[PDB]
Design a protein around this nucleic acid. Structure first.
Ligand SMILES: *C[C@@](*)(O)[C@H](CCCNC(N)=[NH2+])NC(=O)[C@@H]1CCCN1C(=O)[C@H](N)Cc1ccccc1
Lengths: 253, 27
DNA sequence: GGTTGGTGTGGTTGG
């Protein structure tokens, strides 16, 4: 994360790290939305323009982290995928629309002081929470700057959802409805953004209705990390719930 | 069920050092 | 070390 801080133990029991088998490296973040399914972005598994095309084979899933580095001995828990489901309209060529993927872990993850699922947005919550100026909470083991170096710890950043239009005149990228930008305006006097390494990460919110937390976004793209005038684009998790719940109720856990 | 309620944070009625930035947004 | 680093047996945990 860029211009953020350390996660305190158990800040994000949902937050999951995707991590290459061989070459054994981190590829992204996920958020577990339950003892079996995990929410990641697709471009983490499939970006044909850079040869990103992993498979269930190729990936590793480790739930309950904090240290970016060490293998968190009695906390962190490592899982194997059973299957990945990119979104049929995933659009890797153009602009990244419905840049969402699921992946069902092989077998269930025990919950714990450290492992806990996040709330999926409801029609109602979606309505009330997604509003400009309202902060969101994004997370992980990503570049500490654009280019340089990386944390030894999870970083958390508090960033404000940006006006629909403003996101827009920010990129010649052809923005869509399954996209929501997030930021501190140029002159708003405060920084942070997600970054190369960040993606699949959850962009959470807390209903002051029940005080539970929700996934609004997903880390998706943007140009650089904390460029002045640039805002990270997430995935309208809401916008895509429907498919999101079609599959878990299909061939799920 | 008992989605998004942290076992050491909401779960024990403590809040994080920044949660609070977040409900102050909503005004 | 170790499926781990070391701020080195403590910690988000053994020994
Ligand atoms: C996986 C990722 O970390 C990443 C998210 C980073 C975005 N940064 C911020 N601060 N929000 N996703 C990507 O980098 C995707 C996948 C491949 C390229 N890409 C980008 O976001 C590019 N930086 C720009 C882009 C080009 C083409 C289409 C979409 C985005």
């Amino acid at each position: 994360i860029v211009e953020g801080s350390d996660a305190e133990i158990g800040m994000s029991p949902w937050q999951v790290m995707l991590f290459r088998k061989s070459p054994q490296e981190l590829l992204c973040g996920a958020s577990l939305i339950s003892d079996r399914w995990v929410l990641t972005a697709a471009h983490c598994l499939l970006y044909p323009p850079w040869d990103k095309n992993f498979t269930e084979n190729d990936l590793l899933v480790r739930i309950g982290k904090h240290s970016r580095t060490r293998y968190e001995r009695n906390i962190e828990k490592i899982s194997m995928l059973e299957k990945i489901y990119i979104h049929p309209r995933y659009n890797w060529r153009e602009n990244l629309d419905r840049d969402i993927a699921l992946m069902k872990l092989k077998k269930p993850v025990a919950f714990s002081d450290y492992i806990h699922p996040v709330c999926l947005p409801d029609r109602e919550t979606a309505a009330s929470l997604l509003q400009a100026g309202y902060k969101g909470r994004v997370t992980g083991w990503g570049n500490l700057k654009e280019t340089w170096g990386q944390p030894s710890v999870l970083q958390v950043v508090n960033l404000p959802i940006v006006e629909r239009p403003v996101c827009k005149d920010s990129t010649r990228i052809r923005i869509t409805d399954n996209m929501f930008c997030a930021g501190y305006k140029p002159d708003e006097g405060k920084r942070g953004d997600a970054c190369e390494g960040d993606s699949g990460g959850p962009f959470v919110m807390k209903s002051p209705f029940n005080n539970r937390w929700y996934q609004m976004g997903i880390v998706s793209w943007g140009e650089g990390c904390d460029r002045d005038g640039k805002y990270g684009f997430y995935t309208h998790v809401f916008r895509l719930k429907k498919w999101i719940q079609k599959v878990i109720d299909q061939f799920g856990e | 069920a008992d989605c998004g309620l942290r076992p050491l944070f909401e779960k024990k009625s403590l809040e994080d050092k920044t949660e609070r930035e977040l409900l102050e947004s909503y005004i």
